[PDB]
Design a protein around this ligand. Sequence first.
Ligand SMILES: *CC(=O)N1CCN(S(=O)(=O)c2cccc(F)c2)CC1
Ligand SMILES: *CC(=O)N1CCN(S(=O)(=O)c2cccc(F)c2)CC1
Lengths: 304, 304
Amino acid sequence: SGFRKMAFPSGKVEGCMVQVTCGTTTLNGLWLDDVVYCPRHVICTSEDMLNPNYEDLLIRKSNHNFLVQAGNVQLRVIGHSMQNCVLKLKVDTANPKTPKYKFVRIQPGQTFSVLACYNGSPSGVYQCAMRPNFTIKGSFLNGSCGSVGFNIDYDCVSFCYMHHMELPTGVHAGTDLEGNFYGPFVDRQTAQAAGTDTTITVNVLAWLYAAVINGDRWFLNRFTTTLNDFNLVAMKYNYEPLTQDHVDILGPLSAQTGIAVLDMCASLKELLQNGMNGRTILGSALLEDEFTPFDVVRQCSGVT
Amino acid sequence: SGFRKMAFPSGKVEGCMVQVTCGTTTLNGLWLDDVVYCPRHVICTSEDMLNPNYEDLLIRKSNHNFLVQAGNVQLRVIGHSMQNCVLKLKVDTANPKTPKYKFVRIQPGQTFSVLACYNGSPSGVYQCAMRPNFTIKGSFLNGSCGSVGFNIDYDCVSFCYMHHMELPTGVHAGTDLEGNFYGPFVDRQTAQAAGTDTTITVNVLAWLYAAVINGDRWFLNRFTTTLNDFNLVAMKYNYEPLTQDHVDILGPLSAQTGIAVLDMCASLKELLQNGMNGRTILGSALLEDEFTPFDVVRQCSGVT
Ligand SMILES: *CC(=O)N1CCN(S(=O)(=O)c2cccc(F)c2)CC1
Ligand SMILES: *CC(=O)N1CCN(S(=O)(=O)c2cccc(F)c2)CC1
């Protein structure tokens, strides 16, 4: 019993983290096979960062200007290319610790683990969600860029995020491992405002199911609702619209608990309308939206 | 910027997790050098667990009854002893992945990472605190016993917890790696009630400092207080008494923020008395007490 904000074990990703230095800028790189992936802004002087022309900046860079260090051993860079907002540094040595891996571009609402790194060295691991406005709420100081977000399916690491940017509002923006930003963000030190950070309704519902399974049941009410009625309340409270697809995804949790999804919707409706009245659910005074239905089933069933 | 509930990178501990089977009971073991540590209740039939005499049960067990599997390879058990509530299984092979390590017995309020495991395989990592009533609020299903809690200082893993028990109230009890329970708990399926789960005041204050550093400042007020006045309010709200030792430990955060510890105390006092009024601090509607002052400095400074 008990339900914790839980990250994937980080070992497989720890084995991939390197330090990348171009000129005076040091950040993190991901070493998979004989390629090191890192943010292209590694080539910028903080001056350059105001209006960088990366293709022009890159012309002035040779393989030998990219200093790649795996622990205390230097890797030989034998090639470099820009793909969107990442550099791919070809090294002469395949990472011996390369796990089975995929690059995936996640959807908003999807959760992942971040391995926060500085100088290619892991400092911590935490669980994130891709927000509906394509930001993440991370913990990233200077030097953390190139830290990656991942999911693990048994022995295959799906890399979904690389850290690039802090917005002026202290929220985080980054790319997939093909170097494409999540959302409208660009790797330039300019005015970039986030859109509405709406709540991930399907994740809240998953987490209410987790609470019932772990004995927290005070919020269960005598009511039901419809998708359309619920969605009127969701709209009012800056919750994402709930779709039949979301209802379908919550099916297994509905089955295990015997609480119809639309009944749990009606409970969430009362929680929005009435608040928590100083009570808590799984040790939270607010409605948690950084657990997916898949996360709830995983943790509640104990997948390794 | 940003402040996350952050676990240590788990790789060094992943490399130590094995499966231990005695009869029909499978749980987790920690393999350090040529010793595998596991809960002694591995030898019990759930019947035995009602009133086990472990010394008597152990007489019926030989080295060959302890099945130890590291991945898909079996370890040869060449010795076994009981130390308090853990078994130490001597194996003929030193764990090649043994990190630098220590066994430490932590104090209540101290935080650590748990690597939740099933069948010797890591499923997730989360951050815990030793509660003032010597329980932890974990995520542990059947098979998770022998999962360990740890801190890392650069390259040295300090093992502080091994999971043994769920209390009827769904909170968790376990031992240090010398097999001594935290608190009054025993490895027997009997009535064991937890004492008052008081809030770790020094940790709340650390986390209020983290909030100021990350730009969450709405709760800062015009007031100060004294340790004695604050402690009267703490008592009333089931907060641990604040000592000069706690004030001393918060010194570095006080220095960096320019907020006197007793000023932050007065802010916490108003938060207790007035509540959050529907506002949040670092995305929390309650006062977080599972960050130590050391955790706040670590994450805010970026130690690896
Ligand atoms: C995005 C990121 O982590 N980095 C690495 C550090 N550099 S920097 O320009 O070297 C720098 C160092 C210290 C303080 C700074 F504000 C920047 C920026 C990109
Ligand atoms: C404490 C712990 O994790 N374990 C391992 C599992 N066993 S058990 O007796 O094999 C068991 C299996 C399934 C369901 C159970 F309730 C118990 C108990 C000790």
